[PDB]
Design a binder for this molecule. Structure first.
Ligand SMILES: Nc1ncnc2c1ncn2[C@@H]1O[C@H](COP(=O)(O)O)[C@@H](O)[C@H]1O
Ligand SMILES: [Mg+2]
Length: 322
């Protein structure tokens, strides 16, 4: 019971254009259910809440005082945030809050902080300083000044929770688009795989260099010009090195991580970005079922072993290589 033209709703949340599309005859009401679940989770987890009413806003408030009871969503997301900090090359840390709050890249008051300000917040970054109580469902930051930032895994977790709300309503065929996070469920009604736009990391969001046939997967796109600060004609993107305080700078311009779960595409993005085109390709080769497309600063495109010869390059300004 598939339609060719889907039920579709677009909003604009978290400063990003969100679109949900369901190709299932009769399942129109599931659009408002998906969006309700996005707005409910986004309100629980955000650290950009100017009112400071979030569950994370409260943990950050009681840093070095007392633990904070949290809902299951927040407790689960933080638990996964800590695990992704273990796997990394010391590259990923949900306690990067104080550094990300200082730069505040992509906000109206985005600035390049002085070296002295950056040196002040670095020693406060340690995921091992986050103690969770299971029997209490409390999260505690052990030292004053620590802050949580879940921005790196927030959209991935939300996309997976949107996908689960979808299948509880027996949706079979859908597209979830949360800016740089895309989930394609089932197939194009016409029977072919979904054609996923692989973002041009040198153009506004939606400009693509090529399509990638996928079905039942997440594509999480990162780029050096997605949300960036330009001070004195020098660019600073949002993926920061917790051990230096500055953005990661290598040959990578864009990466799209193809995974089963969108939270994993978000979760491995930082460590993958941190290691460079070739060091990051090898990092992806250690994850079964995870693959990636890298786009170098010289506009050369690289596939991981599981995606070789599958990506269809359609911008002639870009070339394929090994
Ligand atoms: N090294 C990091 N570890 C954890 N979270 C980070 C890190 N760098 C940036 N973030 C947060 O995650 C966002 C970038 O995630 P993404 O666009 O998925 O690469 C930033 O806006 C910060 O809120
Ligand atoms: Mg991320």
């Amino acid at each position: 019971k598939l339609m060719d033209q889907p039920y579709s709703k677009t909003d604009f949340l978290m400063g990003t254009v969100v679109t949900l599309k369901i190709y299932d005859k009769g399942k129109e009401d599931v659009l408002d259910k998906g969006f309700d679940r996005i707005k409910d989770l986004a309100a629980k987890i955000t650290t950009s809440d100017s009112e400071k009413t979030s569950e994370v806003d409260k943990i950050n408030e009681q840093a070095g005082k007392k633990p904070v009871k949290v809902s299951e969503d927040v407790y689960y997301l933080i638990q996964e945030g800590l695990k992704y900090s273990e796997n990394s090359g010391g590259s990923f840390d949900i306690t990067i809050g104080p550094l990300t709050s200082l730069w505040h890249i992509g906000f109206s008051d985005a600035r390049k902080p002085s070296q002295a300000e950056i040196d002040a917040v670095l020693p406060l970054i340690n995921y091992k300083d986050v103690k969770m109580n299971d029997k209490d469902q409390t999260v505690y930051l052990e030292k004053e000044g620590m802050e949580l930032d879940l921005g790196a895994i927030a959209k991935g977790f939300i996309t997976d929770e949107t996908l689960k709300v979808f299948k509880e309503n027996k949706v079979t065929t859908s597209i979830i688009d949360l800016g740089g996070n895309i989930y394609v469920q089932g197939n194009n009604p016409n029977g072919n795989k979904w054609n996923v736009g692989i973002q041009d990391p040198f153009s506004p969001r939606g400009s693509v260099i090529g399509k990638l046939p996928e079905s039942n997967m997440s594509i999480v796109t990162s780029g050096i010009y997605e949300r960036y600060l330009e001070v004195d004609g020098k660019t600073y993107h949002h993926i920061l090195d917790p051990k230096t305080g500055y953005p990661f700078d290598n040959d990578i311009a864009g990466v799209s991580i193809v995974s089963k779960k969108s939270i994993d595409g978000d979760g491995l993005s930082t460590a993958t970005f941190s290691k460079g085109i070739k060091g990051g390709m090898d990092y992806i080769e250690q994850f079964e079922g995870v693959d990636a497309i890298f786009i170098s600063k010289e506009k050369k495109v690289y596939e991981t072993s599981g995606l070789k010869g599958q990506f269809e390059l359609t911008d002639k300004d870009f070339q394929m290589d090994t």
